[PDB]
């Protein structure tokens, strides 16, 4: 025998690769152009996200309806978390790396008409640097975000979901023991990481509020949304605004 491999290696394998925004820095940085570009970018990342989720250990066994529900509830969280990861790995969290050809500095944050939201997402990137987050921890946390919110009345296969989520939590516990050592700095790190996952709920709440607004006012604001997002948001918005969503917390729940 040798080691007892975890899905971690598998997760690293299915990890989607960078997608370009197709942005041209020479044209005007209007809010219309920036947000429309960002929404089209999201559409492309989303295809990768679904492809990624489809082969996830455990998640792949959930019924189609629960997989769709989970993805529609967590897409913003996944997108934002991945943004902070890229910002961390590519710029040491000095900028918001939406894509290799679309990196936001303070100036673009103001022109996007999303300044405060960009700051919130940036703060997560800052945490990644303060903790020197590892790719291993990151991939498991991504899965945990996918499993971070369910319907108020639970899923179709709730019990199976709870077992899968528990396993991924234990998995994170395994990883948090790796990177460091010194029992102390593992008990502590696991706490900080799960506390960070919880903070994603508040951030996503603000992100979604702005998202639903621009979606509703899409025509008057001239903010385009790709078919991929139109479908997801059209389904997600009604549920979220009616209080059907139930965020799962690790702490202060």
């Amino acid at each position: 025998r040798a080691l007892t491999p975890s899905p971690v290696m598998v997760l690293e394998n299915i990890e989607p690769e960078i997608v370009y925004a197709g942005y041209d820095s020479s044209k005007p940085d209007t809010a219309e152009n920036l947000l429309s570009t960002l929404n089209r970018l999201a559409g492309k990342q989303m295809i990768q996200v679904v492809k990624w989720a489809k082969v996830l250990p455990g998640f792949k066994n959930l019924p189609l309806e629960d997989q769709i529900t989970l993805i529609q509830y967590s897409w913003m969280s996944l997108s934002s978390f991945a943004l902070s990861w890229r910002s961390y790995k590519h710029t040491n969290s000095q900028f918001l790396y939406f894509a290799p050809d679309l990196v936001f500095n303070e100036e673009k944050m103001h022109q996007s008409a999303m300044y405060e939201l960009c700051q919130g997402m940036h703060q997560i990137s800052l945490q990644f640097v303060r903790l020197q987050l590892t790719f291993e921890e990151y991939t498991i946390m991504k899965v945990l975000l996918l499993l971070s919110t369910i319907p108020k009345d639970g899923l179709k296969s709730q019990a199976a979901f709870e077992e899968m989520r528990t396993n991924y939590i234990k998995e994170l516990r395994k990883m948090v023991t790796k990177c460091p050592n010194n029992s102390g700095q593992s008990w502590q790190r696991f706490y900080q990481l799960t506390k960070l996952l919880d903070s994603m709920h508040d951030l996503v709440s603000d992100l979604l509020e702005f998202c639903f607004y621009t979606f509703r006012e899409s025509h008057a604001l001239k903010v385009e949304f790709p078919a991929m997002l139109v479908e997801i948001i059209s389904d997600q918005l009604p549920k979220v605004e009616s209080g059907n969503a139930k965020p799962l917390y690790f702490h202060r729940k």
Partner: peptide, 12 residues
């Protein structure tokens, strides 16, 4: 149902 990008991608 018919179509739905999410459904397609998950069963492609």
């Amino acid at each position: 149902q018919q179509k739905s990008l999410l459904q397609q991608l998950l069963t492609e």
